[PDB]
């Protein structure tokens, strides 16, 4: 997605579990995308170095 699931869900603004879903989305987004693609980038970067 490049942006987490949030473009590929129902809108979570319904009252039940809104904040629960939002921490879920943002935690998923942050952790997997930025940290692990950065791990990959840094690995080949350190390889050239």
């Amino acid at each position: 997605a490049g942006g987490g699931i949030g473009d590929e869900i129902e809108d979570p603004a319904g009252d039940e579990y809104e904040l629960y879903r939002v921490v879920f989305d943002i935690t998923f987004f942050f952790f997997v995308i930025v940290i692990l693609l950065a791990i990959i980038q840094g690995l080949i970067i350190d390889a050239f170095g």
Partner: peptide, 23 residues
Amino acid sequence: RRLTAREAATALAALLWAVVARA
């Protein structure tokens, strides 16, 4: 752990160990 007052009065221990506002 209680919606509106979740981060505040529902769980202050984890709110102090970390500082989240949605759990």
